[PDB]
Design a protein around this ligand. Structure first.
Ligand SMILES: [Ca+2]
Ligand SMILES: [Ca+2]
Ligand code: NA
Length: 221
């Protein structure tokens, strides 16, 4: 699948932060109206240390039938730093993306989008490259404040940066920790909440696109 390569990846952390502060200006928080037909999820594993495997799975909606899996292996060259995840995982994701034949309507990443100290988590950053609506779904908080949702399925609360809403926290599974959902690019807070709820089956904590992408990262190892 095609994409735009907006900048080089081999930057020191200080310069990578500056890149984020320019790219954040380019995010578009627009509603996602209607229902998608094809939904992608992305996950990464590390079979060897600093050797990565990126997997993209494309699902049909609402059936969740698997339409495509792509993967790519490569060396990891940038350390994990909270807030700079894209510089670690972005390049290998894009190598998998170039192989993709099915064009998704929405892409879900393991990580934040808007809920990020510079408003450009990996989901937002990659959204700018691929120019398709994206959503970030994370298991823990990077940035923002929130009231803990009720321990009842579908309970949610907003994530705030002061008075600004940057995402939400959703109890997708009663008795389990919630998930952190934030819009990436061409997505807004209300739409990302609605879509992730639609993608998450009752009894499961994790939405089907990234749940299945994780399954394949483990199998392909
Ligand atoms: Ca951790
Ligand atoms: Ca995983
Ligand atoms: Na991942």
């Amino acid at each position: 699948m095609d994409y735009r390569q907006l900048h080089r990846w081999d930057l020191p952390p200080e310069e990578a932060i500056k890149v984020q502060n320019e790219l954040r200006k380019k995010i578009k928080l627009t509603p996602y109206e209607g229902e998608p037909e094809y939904v992608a999820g992305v996950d990464l594993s590390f079979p060897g240390k600093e050797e990565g495997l990126a997997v993209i799975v494309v699902l049909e909606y609402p059936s969740f039938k698997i339409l495509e899996v792509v993967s790519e292996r490569g060396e990891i060259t940038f350390p994990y730093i909270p807030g700079l995840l894209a510089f670690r995982e972005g390049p290998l994701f894009l190598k998998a993306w170039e192989k993709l034949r099915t064009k998704p309507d929405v892409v879900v990443f393991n990580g934040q989008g808007l809920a990020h100290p510079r408003k450009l988590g990996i989901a937002s950053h990659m959204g700018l490259f691929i120019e398709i609506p994206t959503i970030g779904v994370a298991k823990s908080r990077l940035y923002g404040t929130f009231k803990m949702p009720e321990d009842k399925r579908c309970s949610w609360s907003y994530l705030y940066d002061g008075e600004e809403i940057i995402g939400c926290v959703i109890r997708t599974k009663e008795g389990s920790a919630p998930i952190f959902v934030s819009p990436g690019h061409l997505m807004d807070v209300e739409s990302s909440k609605r879509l992730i709820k639609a993608f998450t089956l009752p009894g499961r904590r994790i939405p089907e696109p990234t749940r299945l992408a994780h399954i394949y990262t483990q199998r392909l190892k």
